[model samples]
Target: AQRWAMPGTELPLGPQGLAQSVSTQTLAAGVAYYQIKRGAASAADFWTVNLGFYATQAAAQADAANLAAAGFATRVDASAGTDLQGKVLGYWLSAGRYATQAEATAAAARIAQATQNRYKPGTRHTSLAGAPTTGPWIVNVLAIDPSRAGAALSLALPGGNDLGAGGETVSAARARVNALAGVNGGFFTNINPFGAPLPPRSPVGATVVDGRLVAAAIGRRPGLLLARDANGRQRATVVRNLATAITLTDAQGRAIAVQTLNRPILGTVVNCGAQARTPTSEPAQDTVCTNYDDLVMYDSLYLRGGASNTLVDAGYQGARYELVVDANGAVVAGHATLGAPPPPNGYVLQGLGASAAWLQAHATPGTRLAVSRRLSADGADLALASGTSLVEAGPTLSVPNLAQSAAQEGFAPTVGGVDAAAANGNWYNGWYVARNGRTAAGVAADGTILLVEIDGRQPTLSVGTSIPETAAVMAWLGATSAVNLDGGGSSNMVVGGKMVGHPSDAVGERGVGDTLMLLP
Candidate 1:
């Protein structure tokens, strides 16, 4: 029994005839000797190395007998390799054990020299079968040559931005929309303490779909709202702060007050569920009671029981309105969402709450309802800038909290002296901190849209970029104005239906609320 070999050396097994050992039984026809060794252990330490990896002990004996005939020592033992992570891979083979490094080194060299390199000798630390272990984290990087035409932005969870399961992973969105490249877009509420994963209660600061405003301006979080026009001209700007409100008056010209926009209308109920609910002084139930005094033009109607308990029925105590509009925002049908025969289109709306009562009284049959809203001079300017396809985003790099330019901020950090940290502290600080994964977007001075995502988390794979690093990267891409989009596990990039960026999540891709995609 020689059972183990040496490390970092292999015995040269040249074509020299081993006439002496060749005549031994171990060298007999159809017999072979397998080597084993302990990995990462002192030469003096020994484990149960078996030569009997053969199907049967008789077979092992047959091989050993042949080795004996060949004048080579032989034995039966168990062996395994040192590389084990979560579990062991397999075992190794050794001729015999050694007492010291010199002995094993000499033995390994002799074996290599004898075999003429046919069988290189190595050592490992032998362990129990199926032992558990850890492995190193490997990091890597993957990149695509940026197309000179730049990037296009589209959304996931199509139609209107409703909260909840309407979303898919960036990989899925890219494939579905047939995008050339894609990345996760914007920050959203991560959790829904109220219930299951639902559309975030906090609306994205600004969002545009097909040149339509899906979510109006809300919140003061600063991030770049990148937008593109029909001409494909791309631009990045800070989130627009719009202070405009819609006013609905009755036939008597009486004003009606309404709840917030793009939000659930809770009727006295403290806690409501996802579905529409009725007002109740009793303990809040799982149903959401929505009184749509004025619905956002692109809002999704989460109606329950059709006309029976719809927003119209709930508001008017069981009656529909006199106007129904198609997705084009024009009045296409009369008496919309009525209990009878339903409207002809896919989308419809009816007034609710005080607004509904006023509409019922004043927006009489055959008469169009007139609504009014007065915007501040600045707000009007912003609304105009938002355009039919504007996206509200940012702590504008050039302007900071305000939509003004760097010249206004005195050319401070693109965030300008405004408290960028207040917009997102984790991100503001983490932007400076070296991170493992990141996603960001920007517009180059030449009008190119840069959609960027960095893979991270895996040590040997890719160490993600920090916020500052992300900013620098955007600037390096020639973006005069840039803003950090949603990053972290949400950071992902897809190309031609395949994930181009290595997502750091354990599950591969994360299902994001939305994605900025480039359509083919």
Candidate 2:
């Protein structure tokens, strides 16, 4: 019999060395399949897939069954009409806890036959099971409700928790965490502990003299990550992003709580071993959206949404919206309806609005003009026009919003010195608008292009940092002006092929979620 030779590796080697060994080469088709050994308790109930095609549904079903028998488990929804949506096929294997993927694969072969497949050994590796179920990262609720007086207390964490890597001062961490968390008002001291790590740390470092979340961050080094609702319903997520493993603990550091959060825009239920504390005002779903799990990296420029207590509820049809920051990353007036909405062409007159007069009066349009367009089954297309009142044309350029518009970047390609690849390259997933978020991309800390993400019901500023912070992340959004679209797990800022921060969630050990990639 003649055999067809595929390139490189076909089977998945275990994490022990196999996966890494063959990771250098591409896997052969019809050879081995990727098997991830999930961590302790997956907050979610089902499994997901990214890219791959299977031969038969039966094959997929059998594989999933084998995994369950191996001690490892997964939500086996390989059928139609389910959350999986019948896009592809693959089984959620339960390979028991193998020290490595190879070990898991070894057990998988036997189980494969037990489940009715002429199963030959394929790829098997222990994937990042995510944070530990019990460790330093602990979730807790307060005994009192601290409101506006919160920022004051947020200033004390660094001294309390010694947070940071290596010599990174806990104080510095506290200060940073406080600065990021204080934009919103604050909470009271009467908050009851909803959840937390056992053996709680000292709870005295900061207190809101008036009302502020910063006080919680400052006073409480490594303050709690609050998750709540607009009506004051809240829960704190406490977790330790460990070096080797993920540790989810309670305030007393006792039993690791298993939780499933229904975020606003984050798809289905996200199962998390750890959760943050409740915010003074904002709710958890409002902050992260519904049904999602993934580590989010906040750009230095737009770090106010959850960081600040001033965020308004921007929730809508599964979208938590907010608009607090203008194009320049500077805090701007929000929900006031100062500037007119973009005209029919998505642009007013010469400038962004009817003219530059409105922009100059209401917005600080950063160094560049970053326009985003979307082709919805709804109203008007997005457009930004010229400039000044008497003469010049302001920086009003329209960004394509529809999928067809994005297709233009590759298909019909626009001429007249308009490089779709170059211009469109700066934008992310056709979702995030980026112009001044980068240094080389014409974005200066002087705050040129305005960045916006939909938060809750209103728009709030998210991030805006000086030139110093632009190296990694730069883009500002006010608590009331900037808006967080489907981000966190969705907004992935990829420089090279590598991820910046520890990814939000490890879906099959591959960054398969939506992301903002920079191709410079």
Candidate 3:
């Protein structure tokens, strides 16, 4: 709640307040103009009515609209001045300049009454002592040339991390990145176990940082992916399925054998964990190796690391094996936790309801191991030769946070040229059909990265763009290739630490699953 101005014959209008009110209109009907110098005002002074002060121009505009509806004349002064507390009171609404203080006060009363006491109108006798050094208001137009060689592009975050922790709105994300400009990134899901009406926001697509995959790609959802190789070259590609697999071999170069695939790459079920033994717990299943997939569980969750412990933890029924490797990818020791053997560095391979007992029995220390993974359906393959290799017999091995590489996946639909938009009916009719706030990322013909945010759901301010419309916008902007990030209330843009675009969420900004930041 805010209080309106009080009627006064002699008063002071702070710089911010004066700027906001005067820029749009003359003082009210009875207002007078006056100039005061050295803190003294002669009879030739200007008189005006002060309506109200607000934190933002939008608030001021909204207030003015209400006042206009009530048949009172109004004007907004943005960047008017600062308050006594040093806060920037940017929006100031004002009314009139009467011939005299008495006349101004009388007119103010009428305005106050008509507005139902919402705005307390007051009169101020003021002399203009030259214009304030800081402002009067001016329209600003900035021109950007992405083709410039030295043009800057960078990313911002709350200390360089992904967005999907919870409770992050688009505006909040904008505030955090504080970029020259930005848009929301990635779709999300509700992960609240209690099923609260408004569950915390979480990301639903693939996410990555510094080469480590945070979230996996949705099977067939095509998404735009951007990657920069070690040589500083940038590439943009569309991904579907993002399927993965592993090829494993021993020191003798003999194939270690793979019997299964895609265990942790999908679903909420804990596909592999405990041994084929009786459980003493109520769930009677693998609880230690829960359903959540991450760096540790992606490869294989180990109930027990060393043999000394009897099923160090418990969970689902499956085949499990133990092995020891050194920094050079040699298998120093291999066996069952049943034999309870120890190794320098250890790994576990749990099969889907099958046993790895033979695997454990066949290997000895000093045996080299190599594991290669398929990153996409037919994309390049990734291989690792570590003193330890934990390969899941799946389409891909969960390549957790690895050094020297960075990659992430997106979904809903992969990227395509403008021609594909007309033929790609799946996404065009589904998520892209609605006109709501949206965020998209693309690459221009000259390798310029484009980050766009479309405001929507507020017809008065903006009416958002559709998927094809999004593609069209990108293509129109000279994007030779592009892909949709996340949209709806999630659309947002921030420039130079200020929110530059309207967000469609009724609550201001919506929390998002992830964000792509531009860095300097």
Candidate 4:
């Protein structure tokens, strides 16, 4: 807990306490002025609060302007917009953040009188992020303390409220603050106080098996199965390619052969689609991919990124190739390389190494591989070729980290102790997920990857880890399962070098356009 600083109150000193306090406030003020340098001071000095009213629009507007004049910025929407609209029935307040119902009721009486009979005081489970309880405080929202955000939120309601017949009272807001008992106060923080590192897992990819790939290959792009002892090799190349097809030998010298696809492409539809923006290509939105191509995506997570959901694009690619071993060391996999303008294209094929247990539990980064044009070929669910190795590698799917992205610098806000509860129940579309516990990279028992992406908005405001803000449009090759594709402007997907959606950002329009897609 940080020490409370009253503007005129003398701060306690432990040699440098006085100096630190002055410096802190000074820094905050400076940042407030420059809009960059004084980080803490700026947040402390300038806070955004949304005020709602059950009374006349003029009254709400007047109060909004009054708060603005008093240094509290406001966003007043007559129609209330998507966030604070229809839900705002009226305003209710609580006795700050209370521990019990009795004390809160005592404060409620004061609120009732101040509203001139317009307000009603009740007992309800309460806190800044109020949840079920034995009995807390409930008063007119307007009765909140001016100094307390919780009080302000409950009263004027920074995002407005579901009010009815009743109006807010400033006195009630004050009592609510007094009742807090010093449990909740202060600015929001970003570094999820609950966030932790990925936990340890047992190794899985150490041992290899005979036969390399799976699934039927049409030409040289067949899959292979590698032997368990086939280690220390930089790149696992296909040693042989037979049109009749024969599974080549591994390090153990076992002969293996996969089949040819009756159809053009073969493989299981591992997974496909996005969680957020669904791409559409009829009219061409540069920021998204709407093509209805289903491929066997390996990972259940890893939704595509960018700003606009209309376009499609990817930062890298990976391909199934056929290679031959020469005395000079020409090792490879696949039947043949389909050559057009570019012979070798796709994400860098870095060799599989240690530290891949994360993928094993979530997916299979295997040496057994296959390819086919048939969606349902050879009665196989997970298409495996004779000798192709299935590898797992992709860049982090996060929004570009921008040096400067929003009106504010980079101070991400968090709900902290109490607001956490209020934030839990709300719907955040594909952006947020409420977990019973905190674990960053684990899938739920039902097979859903639980992740949260809170889009920051003031009225019904929420937040998430800050990422890069980019003008470069992006696209998605939806994983086994994906969500929340496009946001802002650069959401797009390009497949086979075709521009798929409307460009959201000018910078994104300038890049090369082929995108990653499921060929089968």
Name the lDDT value of residue 166 in candidate 2.
Answer: 14
User: What is the number of backbone collisions in each predicted candidate, taken in the order shown?
Assistant: 69, 199, 60, 127
**RMSD of candidate 2 to the true fold?**
26.2
Report how far off residue 447 is in candidate 1 (Å).
1.8
Off by over 4 Å in 3: 1-164, 167-178, 191-193, 196-206, 227-266, 269-373, 377-430
What's model 3's overall lDDT? 0.40
- Per-residue alpha-carbon lDDT of model 2 for 34-85, expressed as tens digits? 1111112123221222111233456555655655565435433221111112
In the range 1-520, model 1's lDDT, one tens digit per residue, is: 2211111332111112211111111111221111211112223334322332342345556546654554457555332211112122222335666544356556656655655654455432222121221111111111221223344445554322334233467777777777666677765434433454443332343454454433433323334444555664544444433333445443446665322233222221112111123342111112223333343221342222132112222233433353443333344454444322223333333444544444455433334434444322234443433432333333344223322231121111122222331121122222333354766655555444455566654433444554444555555444556666666677877656556577877766777656776654
TM-scores, all models, native as reference? 0.47, 0.20, 0.42, 0.18
Off by over 4 Å in 1: 1-152, 155-164, 197-203, 220-388, 398-436, 456-466, 504-508
Residue 373 displacement in candidate 3 (angstroms): 4.8
Residues 418-438 of candidate 4: C-alpha lDDT, one tens digit per residue: 232122112221112111100
lDDT per residue, candidate 3, 298-414, as tens digits? 221111223221221233355555454454676666554433323434433333222354355546766666654434523543222211111111111112221101112211121
Provide C-alpha RMSD values for all models, in order: 22.8, 26.2, 21.0, 25.4
Model 1 worst lDDT window (10 residues): 18-27
The lDDT for every candidate, in the order shown, is 0.40, 0.21, 0.40, 0.20
